[PDB]
Design a protein around this ligand. Structure first.
Ligand SMILES: Nc1ccn([C@@H]2O[C@H](COS(=O)(=O)NC(=O)[C@@H](N)CO)[C@@H](O)[C@H]2O)c(=O)n1
Ligand SMILES: Nc1ccn([C@@H]2O[C@H](COS(=O)(=O)NC(=O)[C@@H](N)CO)[C@@H](O)[C@H]2O)c(=O)n1
Ligand SMILES: [Ca+2]
Ligand SMILES: [Ca+2]
Ligand SMILES: [Ca+2]
Ligand SMILES: [Ca+2]
Ligand SMILES: [Ca+2]
Ligand SMILES: [Ca+2]
Ligand SMILES: [Cl-]
Ligand SMILES: [Cl-]
Lengths: 428, 428
């Protein structure tokens, strides 16, 4: 959610900044609804005042015939409920527009239409030169009997996986290594979160109202008929960021740095023919998430720090990667500034996204009413929120398998992971 | 699913054994539907034969006027489709009855009506005597700021938890210790499984058709309209056991021993006023599951072995417990024989279920068509399946917190978990 006063005082400058993202703000429709809202607001508040007044005149005469007055208060109450219902419907239309507006991109963000306009910032490591034909992670998984896509189709359907034996153990070692790195070295606190969330949570982080189709939704429970319209989380960012919803945080307690390892559920709509083979684009994937709740003046420095925390995972694992600054046209809905990390994938002969690190500014904080204050201060202000993958675990397994494969299909275990695998040097 | 030939040749002896579970088999309704099914089966197969014959008479005359014959084959095809549809509806009614029949209890199982008729087999450890008033895990969680139920209500709703900091780290250490114990010492292979499963999987392990209300169900995806009616898994037993669905296993490859650590999703219907406070009965909980696929003659020995594997977790953790043999009236739907482990819970002054270990016999194997064969053999036979908690992780955290609490609220870390907590001796 954008600042409502910024839409009222600078609509053309807001519309111009959003135009860089390829978003067309309908200023005229929004202005026409808002002018009508003011007329109905005055009409309704006048009806509210007169009903409150005639209700007080009844209480006076009751202790001092209240029949001609009771009929008047009943008629006024009928008219008021009707006026309030009409105003509430108009407010819902204004909200449908306002809550579908993406975040204003920061001036640091390069202007572009899509992913082809993204800017490479840095590059780390040298992609390995192989003395044999490169096998992809799918072929390697079949050789070990450790990645079974057909069993997952039998259990569930397409875009799911079953991992078995040492490759499932390795997937676990990766998530353990990531959590330990962020909690022991990077100052993040560990969290266990619900994997099902409510509508308030989804509005809070921006999945609602615009991206319901990106999610798996659960049918309400019989004994919780009106309070169990849940969705499976697409990322730990959703429950972690909402932990500060409706809170006033003492500024001395900031930054609040949180991490979680969770499965992530995504419908992956519009991905027809894209990443059809392998672990890259599943409906269910594990991810170690980093979330930071910071003071408004520290968010740009926090983004650099969090991106470096995700880079550290790739460096310790010895996985070559490139760091990309996303352009205006390739950023996610909530982001004002994003860096993507793209890992070398030998079988694809390219770099593939493994992390996305964003500064959300006060966009989610506004929706959630997540505030901070110094003890002295006469007013609070909205916090800034940040989120970054550290990392998507299935995609890390793909990069590890392909980059560390031996001529006979054996997988060398990266040195940093050997303590997490009882010192094991190779799988196979 | 029971053996259809056992229902045909010994219905009264089957009905008698099921009566011990408090299940009343409607022999008369089942016999009346089956006598009608035979009449329709003969009628339909006669129509099938005559249509196949007149279709062959067309192909003869076509290569040798096919108009009076085409009209006959069309009319026969109309009558056949109608007869097949009528027979298929009757088959669906017979299946609704057959698939709602629970497993025949083994002769080892004591007869009883409910949990009060269960038999204590053994007891291990001495419940600690405290020099202070015992705090429950909820009070201890609030003292550490590590178990937050109000944040989970805000994110989702009731019967969910948010764990923060060292208590979330400890919950993770428990699951890691369990997986390592079963994979390194107990001969289980590790698996990563889907947490969403299809209708075939749910029928396979017995959740369908009778217990759809025990589950969270997802609405189908727009791009997978007819193939995505999924449910969240209530236990890793559901995807793991279904890995052998429609398979013929070489008997030399048995036993197949599988383990997985997953969240578990349960509607917890009918639990009004029961375990309202704390982690004991959540909609989402982590569990380390053990599943064994064995030869029919080894299932009773496998049950003893698997129960001992779950007991070992409690013993190494120094948690006092009792082992209970469940009576006929307290067993789950698929089980023919069950042992429950019940851990000492100091604040409740009783033992609480932490594991349930079952021999399912060939009940799920029949539904799944999970078979085995020796290379020589002219026929296959159904395998036996077993499942046991090793253990429910949230309930282990409850037992650990309450049993290891210090006078000031600090939690002593059990010696076996200290290597999983970087040698940390106490939380707080
Ligand atoms: N089906 C899929 C979809 C995505 N991913 C991987 O999740 C990462 C974060 O996703 S995000 O959508 O780019 N941002 C987020 O979710 C933020 N909370 C930061 O993590 C991607 O960078 C990609 O590497 C995957 O592994 N499988
Ligand atoms: N809401 C809940 C419900 C149950 N449990 C814990 O799951 C264990 C296994 O569940 S079972 O239903 O008894 N059998 C099974 O699921 C088998 N697959 C073997 O694991 C119980 O013994 C209890 O300790 C919990 O922690 N929270
Ligand atoms: Ca501080
Ligand atoms: Ca992106
Ligand atoms: Ca974002
Ligand atoms: Ca063997
Ligand atoms: Ca039970
Ligand atoms: Ca069972
Ligand atoms: Cl406003
Ligand atoms: Cl049959």
């Amino acid at each position: 959610m954008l600042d409502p006063n910024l839409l009222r005082t600078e609509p053309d400058a807001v519309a111009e900044k959003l135009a860089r993202r390829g978003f067309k703000l309908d200023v005229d429709k929004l202005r026409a609804l808002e002018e009508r809202r003011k007329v109905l607001q005055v009409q309704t508040e006048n009806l509210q005042a007169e009903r409150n007044s005639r209700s007080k005149s009844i209480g006076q005469a009751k202790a001092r015939d209240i029949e001609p007055l009771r009929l008047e208060v009943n008629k006024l109450g009928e008219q008021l409920d009707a006026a309030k219902s009409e105003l509430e419907t108009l407010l819902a239309e204004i909200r449908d527009i306002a809550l579908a507006i993406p975040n204003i991109p920061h001036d640091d963000v390069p202007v572009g239409r899509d992913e082809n306009d993204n800017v490479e910032v840095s590059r780390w490591g040298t992609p390995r030169q192989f003395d044999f034909e490169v096998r992809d992670h799918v072929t390697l998984g079949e050789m070990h009997g450790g990645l079974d896509f057909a069993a997952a189709v039998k259990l569930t359907g397409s875009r799911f996986v079953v991992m078995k034996g040492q490759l499932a153990r390795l997937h676990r070692a990766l998530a353990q290594f990531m959590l330990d790195l962020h909690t022991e070295q990077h100052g993040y606190s560990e969290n266990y979160v619900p994997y099902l969330v409510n509508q308030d949570t989804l509005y809070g982080t921006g999945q609602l109202p615009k991206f319901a189709g990106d999610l798996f939704h659960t049918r309400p429970l019989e004994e919780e008929a009106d309070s169990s319209n849940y969705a499976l989380i697409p990322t730990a960012e959703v429950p972690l960021t909402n932990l500060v919803r409706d809170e006033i945080i003492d500024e001395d307690d900031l930054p609040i740095k949180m991490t979680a390892h969770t499965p992530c559920f995504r419908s992956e709509a519009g991905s027809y023919g894209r990443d059809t083979r392998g672990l890259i684009r599943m409906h269910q994937f594990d991810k170690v998430e980093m979330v930071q709740i910071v003071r408004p003046e520290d968010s740009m420095a926090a983004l650099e720090e969090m991106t470096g925390h995700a880079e550290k995972v790739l460096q310790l694992l010895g996985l070559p990667y490139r760091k990309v600054a996303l352009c205006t046209g390739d950023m996610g809905f909530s982001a004002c500034k994003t860096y993507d990390l793209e890992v070398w994938v030998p079988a694809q002969n390219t770099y593939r996204e493994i992390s996305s690190c964003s500064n959300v500014w006060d966009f989610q904080a506004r929706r959630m009413q997540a505030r901070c204050r110094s003890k002295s201060d006469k007013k609070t202000r909205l916090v800034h929120t940040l989120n970054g993958s550290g990392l998507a675990v299935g995609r890390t397994l793909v990069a590890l398998m392909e980059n560390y494969q031996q001529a006979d299909g054996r997988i060398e275990i990266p040195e940093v992971l050997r303590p997490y695998m009882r010192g094991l040097e190779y799988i196979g």
